[PDB]
Write an enzyme that holds these catalytic residues in place. Structure first.
Site, PDB file in Angstrom:
ATOM      1  N   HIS B 337       0.849  -1.199   0.000  1.00 35.64           N
ATOM      2  CA  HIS B 337       0.000   0.000   0.000  1.00 35.64           C
ATOM      3  C   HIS B 337       0.880   1.243   0.000  1.00 35.64           C
ATOM      4  O   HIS B 337       0.382   2.357   0.116  1.00 35.64           O
ATOM      5  CB  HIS B 337      -0.865   0.106   1.258  1.00 35.64           C
ATOM      6  CG  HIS B 337      -1.624  -1.129   1.609  1.00 35.64           C
ATOM      7  ND1 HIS B 337      -1.054  -2.178   2.295  1.00 35.64           N
ATOM      8  CD2 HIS B 337      -2.929  -1.444   1.455  1.00 35.64           C
ATOM      9  CE1 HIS B 337      -1.979  -3.082   2.556  1.00 35.64           C
ATOM     10  NE2 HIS B 337      -3.126  -2.659   2.059  1.00 35.64           N
ATOM     11  N   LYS B 528      -9.157  13.563   5.330  1.00 37.02           N
ATOM     12  CA  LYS B 528      -8.210  12.467   5.228  1.00 37.02           C
ATOM     13  C   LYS B 528      -7.012  12.893   6.064  1.00 37.02           C
ATOM     14  O   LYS B 528      -6.928  14.041   6.509  1.00 37.02           O
ATOM     15  CB  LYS B 528      -7.771  12.276   3.771  1.00 37.02           C
ATOM     16  CG  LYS B 528      -7.026  13.489   3.190  1.00 37.02           C
ATOM     17  CD  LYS B 528      -6.786  13.355   1.694  1.00 37.02           C
ATOM     18  CE  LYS B 528      -8.097  13.384   0.923  1.00 37.02           C
ATOM     19  NZ  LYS B 528      -8.265  12.192   0.055  1.00 37.02           N
ATOM     20  N   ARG B 529      -6.093  11.968   6.293  1.00 41.11           N
ATOM     21  CA  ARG B 529      -4.916  12.304   7.064  1.00 41.11           C
ATOM     22  C   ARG B 529      -4.206  13.497   6.453  1.00 41.11           C
ATOM     23  O   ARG B 529      -4.185  13.674   5.235  1.00 41.11           O
ATOM     24  CB  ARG B 529      -3.962  11.118   7.118  1.00 41.11           C
ATOM     25  CG  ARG B 529      -4.320  10.142   8.183  1.00 41.11           C
ATOM     26  CD  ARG B 529      -4.446  10.874   9.506  1.00 41.11           C
ATOM     27  NE  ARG B 529      -4.249   9.938  10.585  1.00 41.11           N
ATOM     28  CZ  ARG B 529      -3.074   9.661  11.133  1.00 41.11           C
ATOM     29  NH1 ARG B 529      -1.969  10.274  10.724  1.00 41.11           N
ATOM     30  NH2 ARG B 529      -3.008   8.720  12.060  1.00 41.11           N
ATOM     31  N   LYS B 534      -0.900  14.499   0.152  1.00 41.35           N
ATOM     32  CA  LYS B 534      -2.353  14.583  -0.016  1.00 41.35           C
ATOM     33  C   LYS B 534      -2.733  16.004  -0.398  1.00 41.35           C
ATOM     34  O   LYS B 534      -3.836  16.271  -0.884  1.00 41.35           O
ATOM     35  CB  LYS B 534      -3.077  14.149   1.262  1.00 41.35           C
ATOM     36  CG  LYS B 534      -3.048  12.637   1.468  1.00 41.35           C
ATOM     37  CD  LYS B 534      -3.702  12.225   2.780  1.00 41.35           C
ATOM     38  CE  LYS B 534      -3.558  10.722   3.039  1.00 41.35           C
ATOM     39  NZ  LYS B 534      -4.333   9.898   2.058  1.00 41.35           N
ATOM     40  N   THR B 633      -9.535   5.627  -0.543  1.00 37.63           N
ATOM     41  CA  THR B 633     -10.816   4.961  -0.313  1.00 37.63           C
ATOM     42  C   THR B 633     -11.889   5.975   0.043  1.00 37.63           C
ATOM     43  O   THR B 633     -13.069   5.732  -0.166  1.00 37.63           O
ATOM     44  CB  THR B 633     -10.717   3.889   0.790  1.00 37.63           C
ATOM     45  OG1 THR B 633     -10.033   4.418   1.928  1.00 37.63           O
ATOM     46  CG2 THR B 633      -9.972   2.671   0.265  1.00 37.63           C
ATOM     47  N   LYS B 637     -15.926   6.539  -1.043  1.00 33.50           N
ATOM     48  CA  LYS B 637     -17.022   6.822  -0.124  1.00 33.50           C
ATOM     49  C   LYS B 637     -17.822   8.023  -0.601  1.00 33.50           C
ATOM     50  O   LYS B 637     -19.052   7.992  -0.610  1.00 33.50           O
ATOM     51  CB  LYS B 637     -16.474   7.079   1.284  1.00 33.50           C
ATOM     52  CG  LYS B 637     -15.765   5.871   1.872  1.00 33.50           C
ATOM     53  CD  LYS B 637     -15.005   6.226   3.137  1.00 33.50           C
ATOM     54  CE  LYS B 637     -13.973   5.163   3.441  1.00 33.50           C
ATOM     55  NZ  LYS B 637     -13.203   5.729   4.528  1.00 33.50           N
TER      56      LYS B 637
HETATM   57  C1  LIG Z   1     -11.819   6.086   4.610  1.00 32.11           C
HETATM   58  C2  LIG Z   1     -11.064   6.784   5.594  1.00 32.11           C
HETATM   59  C3  LIG Z   1      -9.718   7.151   5.377  1.00 32.11           C
HETATM   60  C4  LIG Z   1      -8.982   6.959   4.028  1.00 32.11           C
HETATM   61  O1  LIG Z   1      -9.145   8.223   3.326  1.00 32.11           O
HETATM   62  P1  LIG Z   1      -8.367   8.606   1.984  1.00 32.11           P
HETATM   63  O2  LIG Z   1      -9.011   9.907   1.669  1.00 32.11           O
HETATM   64  O3  LIG Z   1      -8.652   7.490   1.074  1.00 32.11           O
HETATM   65  O4  LIG Z   1      -6.968   8.695   2.422  1.00 32.11           O
HETATM   66  C5  LIG Z   1      -9.019   7.766   6.366  1.00 32.11           C
HETATM   67  N1  LIG Z   1      -9.568   8.056   7.582  1.00 32.11           N
HETATM   68  C6  LIG Z   1     -10.867   7.732   7.829  1.00 32.11           C
HETATM   69  C7  LIG Z   1     -11.453   8.102   9.192  1.00 32.11           C
HETATM   70  C8  LIG Z   1     -11.634   7.092   6.835  1.00 32.11           C
HETATM   71  O5  LIG Z   1     -12.950   6.807   7.081  1.00 32.11           O
HETATM   72  C1  LIG Z   2       0.898   2.917   3.926  1.00 30.75           C
HETATM   73  C2  LIG Z   2      -0.558   3.267   3.758  1.00 30.75           C
HETATM   74  O1  LIG Z   2      -1.223   3.560   4.750  1.00 30.75           O
HETATM   75  N1  LIG Z   2      -1.053   3.239   2.494  1.00 30.75           N
HETATM   76  C3  LIG Z   2      -2.414   3.656   2.180  1.00 30.75           C
HETATM   77  O2  LIG Z   2      -3.183   2.447   1.964  1.00 30.75           O
HETATM   78  C4  LIG Z   2      -4.550   2.596   1.490  1.00 30.75           C
HETATM   79  C5  LIG Z   2      -5.177   1.203   1.372  1.00 30.75           C
HETATM   80  O3  LIG Z   2      -4.624   0.478   0.263  1.00 30.75           O
HETATM   81  C6  LIG Z   2      -4.557   3.357   0.133  1.00 30.75           C
HETATM   82  O4  LIG Z   2      -5.904   3.519  -0.344  1.00 30.75           O
HETATM   83  C7  LIG Z   2      -3.852   4.724   0.286  1.00 30.75           C
HETATM   84  O5  LIG Z   2      -3.808   5.389  -0.994  1.00 30.75           O
HETATM   85  C8  LIG Z   2      -2.402   4.540   0.885  1.00 30.75           C
HETATM   86  O6  LIG Z   2      -1.792   5.807   1.138  1.00 30.75           O
END
Ligand SMILES: *Cc1c(COP(=O)(O)O)cnc(C)c1O
Ligand SMILES: CC(=O)N[C@@H]1O[C@H](CO)[C@@H](O)[C@H](O)[C@H]1O
Ligand SMILES: O=C(NCCOCCOCCNC(=O)c1cc2cc(Cl)ccc2[nH]1)c1cc2cc(Cl)ccc2[nH]1
Ligand SMILES: *Cc1c(COP(=O)(O)O)cnc(C)c1O
Ligand SMILES: CC(=O)N[C@@H]1O[C@H](CO)[C@@H](O)[C@H](O)[C@H]1O
Lengths: 787, 787
Positions: B337, B528-529, B534, B633, B637
């Site tokens: 990942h 997101k984080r 990002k 992901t 959503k």
């Molecule tokens: C789904 C989800 C993520 C992943 O988010 P990305 O925008 O795909 O990095 C991170 N944190 C929470 C709380 C989520 O529900």
């Molecule tokens: C190391 C790590 O947390 N990788 C993360 O894994 C998720 C699940 O595959 C990906 O959707 C995302 O882009 C990626 O940054």
């Protein structure tokens, strides 16, 4: 509450609560399923009981203690709820052994010995007497350590009794409270302020305390400590605040001035008082506080509750000092359980100042108004002042917590006549002379539920069939047994019960250790904390003496059992343990002695084990040096369970003699004034060593290496102490003790006479029920009424 | 089941389980009463499901991960068990608000973000697909920290989610296992022996994982670490062993080589493998292991599972290396990942040697037979060897965990086509060339239960009424929504659902922060984080750009929401947070802008909060630099919930474009090869700063102190990074991004066109269901069959 429903409930819990079926259910699962099934029967009454206290608002009693030696809860709960036989049947029909299930439960060993166990018996009696009582303590994650024996020495193992979860506790998150530490004082115009403090959260866990067959279920509330790269460390560091309620200090009658211990003391005290204040308010305003609240200080450990209550009244409730002070005294009552100077709690002022700066101030203030009163009454008596001061300043000033408890309480009590007298007329003479009526006596007691109905169903049943069941709630009724003094059949039935207990316990001993137990041997046992003042060392000397006798003239056979835990840092106690194990090794293996004499060091002595060994003992050893055992309670347990007592005129031993008649107890040795005279003249141990050939041999053997050939000088420390530093005059009672022992053997050869004496002891046990003890506390201290 | 019974069950638990009545019951008590009521419905199926796996022995799938971002369980359980409406009714009739009850539950935030959340969605899909799947992880006492904002900066607070107890977990004491650390190796004649190790006990806690409406309840087994004056310290020191499962390392896409982290990795791995071996045996012997067991390595974090399995096979089961090695490869599958070099796990050999000496040996061995194979195939290619070695020795040798996972697994997969391609043809080219068939792609997915039925009942209901309920288990069925492309009424019903979500979330925003939300404003959100790759920084530039536009020419109003947690030690991420809060402060308060634009930094972004904000968003920001988001992901959503996407051709964004048609997504910026060309030519940030007036202003403002007057140089670090060290070419996409944003606003002015695009997005969401993802894993990696 019928067998069919208990069984369906059991299966329901095994399923929904344990998520198991009969195929993969563990023994532990079954214990839990049963625990839950029993627990459900407590709720209704628990909720109603607490509701009742709120509605009727009777005065509440708060037993504040750092220890609650509760033992196991399952069986005790079944009995007090009158569910044991029905549950026994239910479990039987399910193809399970309820005894095996019961052995699964961990002891709630949140106590060291007598002090902690007294709190447990009291909770049981107070609930049985229908008092609006509450137990307040600390929920240690680790209770009194589990004791193991490796190469003859005591080895400690962490007692994480909560490992698999405690079904008997219910966390009460909504009642969490903050406790403050360190920081500094600031005397603002808005009042005094304790600022920049560290905060530790106190999470209460409630455990139900069912009265014996009476619908009341009281509460024991124990507090758990909770915190309020670099980030990771900070999280890990939360352990520090939580370490406060982590472990029970394993000391019995010994003061260890560790800062963590002081933290625990303030912790339980701060949370408790706050919780009590909150509840009072939920019921000028505090004028009725003393009439609604009584707080019993179980020894000086919670002494800080006095300045804490003052702190709350003054700094928070803004009450004037005078008013707050009177309310305080009316609220607190202090129980002294100490005699040994090493057990005395004396916190260095510097430590208290750093941890509880505001409390130190409040303490100096208390002391100030205290000494001003003395100077006013005794203008010239200067020694009087520093003698009655809460602070002793002989290089490293420290706080005499006992003095703080005396001035902050309206009642001070000892735990046995002899002890209460010493406390009143000697230790705190300067105080009692000013306040005669303040000092009292409340002779200890044990609950006849756990210590008779529970641990000795055979004896309980026999007694019930002869005099009814009234004695369970009124132990004094045991005197009715006197009508059977001539009844040969009864005397035989009594001895049989003892035999059965001994047989059952012998199986235990054999499965646990490789020693063939003589089922017809007299069971001579001394189980209690290992301490020089308790003198199991003297017992050991006698054991050796008997060994040398068998070896010389190859007699009533006996199984000598000595058990007890030694505080980890108590060197002499640990040596004494090794001494006992060493001696047992030679005696149990010497082919010449064979089944004539067997010695067992009962490992991991604790409440659940006491319930097993006591009912099976014939001779109870209560040989502390006159004036050292404030009271003792095991002595009472043995008496209630059909054992004869060999002991000194010390603590409650004296009253046991008064009750049953001194001729029915094997009393011996020096008495308090005798010990005084010897101290006067000066104790010269070597004297007896010389004048007593049997003693000299014993000593020579242990000092020569007879009991430690591979290491001849092993017991050097014991020898030196016994010869030049024995504060408990072991040699001084050796002869009287040995002669007394022979008399015991003599009586034992006469079954009719022995059991006749046993009957007189059991029949005179009444006074020692903690129910009687609590009634006295209620009537003369708490001003509370049963129900 | 029915309302009446659910209510009686609720009251029963409130009484027997919480020991409360309606008078003193807390909201928390009610939540627990409901949780238990719902939980009881899981047991039957849970026991039967696990029983079934044992009887029928289907191949088992073990998802081994250091993270499980589960969120809350109550509602998810009610929905998957088809109990939500009945419970809703029950609670309503009891005069309680089920939503208020639900808000009481703590998130099981045992994950950082995408990686951990993917594990959660997978458990849900695997249970819904009836696979004999198990989740294996660590039961951190503290999950991802709770984030608070003080003076505009992120502040972390310990997340003790277990404070009040977790009703959704069942401790499995009988399955406790020992895990070894440190010690040393000894190659005796009886085999290799790892001795003198420190032991930490692993206590498993099982959490039920209910499939959606299918009677199967799988298990998520999380391991907790438990220990196996001086005495007091020793007890307190038990915290050390227990610190292993204490806290979740809060890093997202960043490798922190802390020894405690390595301990956690081995801890979960050792306990899991042992537990798996034990279960296999309870079913020459291990010849069928690979056909009965599949272990998915969620990233390299559990890489040690490879040498651990070998250790068990060899040192314990005495299997010959060759055999053990083949069995190992057949058992493991590895999912990559990561893309960022800083996220790469590379443990220094010295650390591994000290902590896991035997594993280091086994790793060198693996590497040896690995390199011998390469040399044999490429006798002359020397660079090849050190390029494919598991050990890189450029000053402080370290272990490339990814390489270990590649050689020890039979399948390696990326999480999105673009990513899997890069992983295969570029990052691990040397490996894929030798084993083409080993590398695969398994495009990520999200569960439509939690991420649709749960979080967006309105949308779920609307869709159900138009095309039935088949889509819940087969999301591809959403394409049927295409039949309503011309349906004006439907388009209106769809927009209404969004409006309601926005209104509901606006109340939330207002009660939480002092900002009046324009209910008709477009909800532009990036949650997101927080990470430079990002690029919420780019989003911030655009926000400022819009601010300067309103100020200049006082437009589609919008509420810009940016939320996410920054790793405690991630300096730039924290600065970016302060930057966002600073900017929001000026824009939300500038009277000239008023309700035209509002900015909110969504605090404590987590699973339960994502369930609230996502359903209410119009524009989803997925603007990572091409080639940085392996998949993403949240992007899925938002798509599923009626939001349009503005993003780069990165990760799954590409496939979302493929599914819905690129014209229905607001794609912009450089693409992977474009980024490559710029790196080639060399990125000169100043270029755009000069050539882009709107950009220059923005930069000047932030660097001048316009957004931090009281501290003009505050954002110096961001400026420097952006100008001389921006690895993510923020300025390089600024123009394309801003132009794209305007187009979004344009479309937003046309409700019919906007919702028409929304419909095409929702209708093309099907592919992104984790059910589809799991089906592919099952068919092409685990060799397992659904149902
Ligand atoms: C789904 C989800 C993520 C992943 O988010 P990305 O925008 O795909 O990095 C991170 N944190 C929470 C709380 C989520 O529900
Ligand atoms: C190391 C790590 O947390 N990788 C993360 O894994 C998720 C699940 O595959 C990906 O959707 C995302 O882009 C990626 O940054
Ligand atoms: O953990 C479980 N069972 C163990 C028992 O629960 C421990 C917590 O108990 C609930 C809170 N109540 C009390 O702690 C309590 C009630 C109570 C009543 C009395 Cl009279 C005295 C003390 C008391 N304590 C458990 C069961 C289960 C089933 C599924 Cl399907 C999933 C997860 C699961 N966990
Ligand atoms: C009763 C009891 C004690 C007190 O014993 P004494 O002989 O009175 O010191 C100590 N330990 C346990 C386990 C007890 O039950
Ligand atoms: C401080 C302390 O533990 N004291 C102990 O208290 C119990 C309970 O009163 C007495 O029976 C015993 O003699 C005494 O040694």
């Amino acid at each position: 509450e019928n067998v069919a429903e208990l069984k369906k409930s059991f299966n329901r819990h095994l399923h929904f609560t344990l998520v198991k079926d009969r195929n993969v259910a563990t023994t532990r699962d079954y214990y839990f399923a049963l625990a839950h099934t029993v627990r459900d029967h407590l709720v209704g009454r628990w909720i109603r009981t607490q509701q009742h206290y709120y509605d009727k608002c009777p005065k509440r009693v708060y037993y504040l203690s750092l220890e609650f030696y509760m033992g196991r809860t399952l069986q005790n709960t079944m009995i007090n709820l009158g569910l044991q036989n029905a549950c026994d049947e239910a479990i039987y029909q399910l193809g399970l052994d309820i005894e095996e299930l019961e052995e699964i439960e961990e002891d709630a060993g949140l106590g060291n010995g007598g002090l902690g166990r007294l709190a447990a018996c009291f909770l049981d009696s107070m609930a049985t007497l229908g008092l609006a009582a509450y137990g307040y303590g600390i929920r240690y994650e680790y209770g009194i350590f589990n004791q193991k024996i490796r190469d003859g020495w005591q080895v400690e193992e962490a007692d994480d009794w909560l490992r698999y979860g405690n079904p008997w506790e219910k966390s009460r998150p909504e009642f969490m409270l903050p406790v403050h530490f360190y920081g500094k004082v600031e005397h603002t115009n808005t009042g005094t302020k304790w600022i920049d403090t560290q905060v530790v959260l106190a999470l209460p866990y409630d455990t139900p305390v069912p009265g014996y067959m009476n619908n009341t279920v009281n509460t024991m509330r124990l507090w758990s400590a909770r915190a309020p790269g670099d980030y990771i460390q900070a999280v890990l560091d939360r352990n520090l605040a939580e370490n406060i309620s982590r472990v029970l200090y394993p000391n019995d009658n010994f003061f260890e001035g560790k800062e963590l211990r002081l933290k625990q003391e303030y912790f339980v005290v701060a949370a408790t008082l706050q919780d009590i204040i909150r509840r009072f308010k939920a019921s000028t305003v505090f004028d009725a506080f003393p009439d609604q609240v009584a707080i019993q200080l179980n020894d000086t450990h919670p002494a800080l509750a006095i300045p804490e209550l003052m702190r709350i009244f003054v700094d928070i409730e803004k009450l004037p000092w005078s008013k707050a002070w009177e309310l305080t005294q009316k609220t607190f009552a202090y129980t002294n359980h100490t005699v040994l100077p090493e057990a005395l709690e004396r916190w260095p002022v510097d430590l208290v100042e750093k941890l509880l700066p505001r409390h130190l101030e409040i303490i100096y203030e208390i002391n100030q108004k205290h000494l001003d009163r003395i100077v006013a009454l005794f203008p010239k008596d200067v020694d009087r002042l520093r003698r009655m001061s809460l602070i002793e300043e002989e290089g490293s000033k420290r706080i005499n917590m006992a003095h703080l408890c005396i001035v902050g309480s309206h009642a001070v009590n000892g735990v046995a006549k002899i002890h209460s007298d010493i406390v009143k007329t000697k230790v705190f003479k300067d105080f009692s002379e000013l306040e005669p009526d303040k000092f009292q006596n409340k002779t200890n007691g044990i609950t006849p539920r756990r210590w008779l109905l529970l641990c000795n169903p055979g004896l309980a049943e026999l007694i019930a069939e002869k005099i009814g069941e009234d004695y369970v709630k009124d132990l004094s009724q045991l005197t009715k047994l006197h009508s059977f003094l001539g009844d040969d059949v009864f005397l035989r039935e009594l001895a049989k019960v003892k035999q059965e207990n001994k047989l059952k316990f012998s199986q235990f001993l054999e499965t646990e250790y490789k020693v063939k137990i003589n089922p017809s041997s007299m069971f001579d046992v001394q189980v209690k904390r290992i301490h020089e003042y308790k003198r199991q060392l003297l017992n050991c000397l006698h054991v050796i003496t008997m060994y040398n006798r068998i070896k010389k003239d190859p007699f009533v056979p006996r199984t000598v059992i000595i058990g007890g835990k030694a505080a980890p840092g108590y060197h002499m106690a640990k040596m004494i343990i090794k001494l006992i194990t060493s001696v047992a090794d030679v005696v149990n293996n010497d082919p010449m002695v064979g089944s004539k004499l067997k010695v067992i060091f009962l490992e991991n002595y604790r409440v659940s084990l006491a319930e097993k060994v006591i009912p099976a003992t014939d001779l109870s050893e209560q040989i502390s040096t006159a004036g050292t055992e404030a009271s003792g309670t095991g002595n009472m347990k043995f008496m209630l369970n059909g054992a004869l007592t060999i002991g000194t005129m010390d603590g409650a031993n004296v009253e046991m003699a008064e009750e049953a008649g001194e001729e029915n107890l094997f009393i011996f040795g020096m008495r308090i004034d005798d010990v005084a005279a010897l101290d006067k003249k000066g104790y010269e141990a070597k004297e007896y060593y010389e004048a007593l050939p049997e003693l000299k041999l014993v000593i020579d053997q242990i000092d020569n290496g007879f009991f430690s050939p591979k290491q001849p000088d092993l017991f050097k420390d014991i020898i030196n102490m016994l010869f030049y530093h024995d504060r408990f005059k072991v040699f001084a009672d050796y002869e009287a003790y040995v002669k007394c022992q022979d008399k015991v053997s003599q009586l034992y050869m006469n079954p009719k006479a022995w059991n006749t004496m046993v009957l007189k002891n059991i029949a005179a046990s009444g006074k020692f029920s903690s129910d009687r003890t609590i009634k006295e506390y209620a009537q003369n201290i708490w001003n509370v009424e049963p129900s």
